[PDB]
Each structure stands twice: as structure tokens, then as C-alpha cells.
Amino acid sequence: MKIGIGSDHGGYNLKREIADFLKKRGYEVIDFGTHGNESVDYPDFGLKVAEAVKSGECDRGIVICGTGLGISIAANKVPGIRAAVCTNSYMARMSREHNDANILALGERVVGLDLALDIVDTWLKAEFQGGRHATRVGKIGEIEKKYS
Amino acid sequence: MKIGIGSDHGGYNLKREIADFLKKRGYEVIDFGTHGNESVDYPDFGLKVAEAVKSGECDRGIVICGTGLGISIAANKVPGIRAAVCTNSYMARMSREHNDANILALGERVVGLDLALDIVDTWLKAEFQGGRHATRVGKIGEIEKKYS
Numbered sequence: 001m002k003i004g005i006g007s008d009h010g011g012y013n014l015k016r017e018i019a020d021f022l023k024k025r026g027y028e029v030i031d032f033g034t035h036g037n038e039s040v041d042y043p044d045f046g047l048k049v050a051e052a053v054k055s056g057e058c059d060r061g062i063v064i065c066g067t068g069l070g071i072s073i074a075a076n077k078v079p080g081i082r083a084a085v086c087t088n089s090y091m092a093r094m095s096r097e098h099n100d101a102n103i104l105a106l107g108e109r110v111v112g113l114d115l116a117l118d119i120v121d122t123w124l125k126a127e128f129q130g131g132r133h134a135t136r137v138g139k140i141g142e143i144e145k146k147y148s
Numbered sequence: 149m150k151i152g153i154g155s156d157h158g159g160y161n162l163k164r165e166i167a168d169f170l171k172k173r174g175y176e177v178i179d180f181g182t183h184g185n186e187s188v189d190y191p192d193f194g195l196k197v198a199e200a201v202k203s204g205e206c207d208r209g210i211v212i213c214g215t216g217l218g219i220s221i222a223a224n225k226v227p228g229i230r231a232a233v234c235t236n237s238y239m240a241r242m243s244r245e246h247n248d249a250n251i252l253a254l255g256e257r258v259v260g261l262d263l264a265l266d267i268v269d270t271w272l273k274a275e276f277q278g279g280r281h282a283t284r285v286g287k288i289g290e291i292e293k294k295y296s
Contacts, residue, residue, distance in 0.1 A: 070247050095215070098215075098217075099221060132189075139189055147296065
């Protein structure tokens with residue numbers, strides 16, 4: 001499974017740790033940047049990861065900024081993308097089970113390292129539950145079609 | 149300001165408490181439903197609140213589901229909407245200061261009542277900081293224009 005990862009400067013250090021974590025677990029990781037601590041704009045990297053997941057270049061993606069909020073909002077502007085900002089493993093599991101999230105969003109200034117790794121672990125293992133949850137995801141698709 | 153509020157059945161009881169909280173505070177509250185515990189679909193109510201904020205019928209919105217994730221993803225599909233899932237007041241403050249969030253999303257199964265009221269209090273009081281944050285919000289707007 002190919003994981004796309006991306007961040008602004010606010011999520012760069014956590015991105016480094018998650019990339020190492022994932023590779024060590026045998027995932028193929030595509031790093032979309034940013035590649036340093038210099039101030040940059042979260043939508044640019046949110047977009048890169050979202051478009052890679054949309055195109056199938058990556059199976060899913062992880063985006064990080066100070067809070068995860070900006071980068072996940074940006075990613076959610078792309079049709080077919082469902083980016084979930086999670087601050088605990090319960091949320092991470094429900095994002096997969098109910099929302100079939102294909103992007104996990106994290107906030108480097110909010111969650112500490114080991115917690116963030118717990119969340120990533122949980123998110124990568126959880127499975128979409130279909131049924132009424134598929135019906136609700138379709139209704140998200142209807143909003144996209146409306147504003148398309 | 150006029151506050152739009154909406155939920156599925158997973159956020160209905162918290163919605164009831166927040167509606168009461170806001171009115172006691174002097175806010176005009178527009179309740180878009182749901183109006184009971186019957187199973188319903190979060191995108192329908194996410195859409196209502198998002199469209200009310202977009203039209204200027206409400207100045208800001210609050211959306212609630214079990215985790216806040218589904219309803220906020222749905223809301224974020226609407227152009228001009230920036231919905232922030234917050235699990236603490238630090239996130240709530242940054243969502244206004246940096247992301248100029250116009251919708252707050254909450255997870256009734258994640259945050260307890262008093263915490264959720266603290267987050268709402270913080271979110272309503274926080275102020276957009278402009279500058280590079282406006283530049284970044286514009287870049288969110290560019291993604292919307294791309295996929296419009």
C-alpha cells in the first residue's frame with residue numbers, strides 16, 4: 001500500500017517521524033514535502049497529497065500542519081477526498097469505519113509523537129464498514145456533484 | 149450574530165445543550181435539525197448549515213455528529229465553507245485565528261458536555277488574524293475554483 005504524506009513547516013518534524021515509522025513497517029511512502037522548516041502554505045501540500053490519492057498514485061494519504069485543520073480543509077475541497085482530522089485513536093477508527101476516510105490529518109502542535117503514531121497505527125488498520133455508511137458517503141458525493 | 153446549528157442523531161443531544169447555551173448568551177440560533185434521536189444522515193444537516201452560512205442567512209455555524217468528522221467533511225464540500233473539527237479550545241482558537249473557520253464541528257461521542265461548551269465559548273470569541281493567513285485561505289479558494 002502506497003502512502004502519500006505532506007505537510008507545511010508546522011507539520012514537517014512530525015512528517016519526518018511518520019515517514020520513518022511507515023517505511024520501517026514496509027509501506028511505500030511518497031513524500032510530497034514540505035522538505036524543511038521554512039514558512040510555507042499548507043494548501044499547496046494538502047492539494048499535492050489529495051490529488052495523488054484521487055489519481056490512485058497513492059492509496060491513501062497523511063497530511064500534517066500545526067493543528068491539522070488547514071491542510072485537511074484544503075484536501076477536502078478535492079472531489080473524492082475525505083480527510084479526517086483525528087486527535088485520538090477512537091476518531092481514527094471511526095473515520096475509516098464510518099467515513100471511509102482516505103486522508104488522515106494530524107496537528108503536530110496538538111498531539112505528541114507517540115500519540116500521533118498510535119493514531120496512524122489505528123487508522124491504517126481500521127476497515128470501512130459499508131452499509132448505511134456507504135449511503136452517507138454517497139450523499140457527500142452528491143454535495144460534490146452539486147458544486148462541481 | 150446569527151448561529152446556524154445542525155446535527156445527525158449522533159449529535160442531537162449535544163446540539164440541544166449548545167442551542168440553550170447560545171440563546172442564554174443572547175445569540176439568535178437557527179436550528180436546522182435533526183429534531184430527534186431517529187437515525188438520519190449527517191450530510192443532509194451538514195449541507196443545510198453550510199448553505200445557510202454561505203448565503204449569509206447565518207453568520208457562522210456549528211455542526212455535530214458522533215465524531216464531528218462526517219458532518220464537517222460534508223460541510224467543507226461547499227465553496228466558501230471552512231469547517232473545523234475541534235476537540236480542545238486550542239484548536240478552536242487556531243481555527244478562527246489562522247483558518248478563519250466559519251463552521252465549528254463537534255463530536256458528541258468524543259468531547260463531554262462542559263468541554264464542548266468551553267470549545268464553543270473559545271471559538272465564538274476568537275478573531276481572524278489576517279496577513280499570511282488570508283493568503284493561505286485564498287489558496288483554499290483556488291482549490292475550490294479548480295474543482296468548481
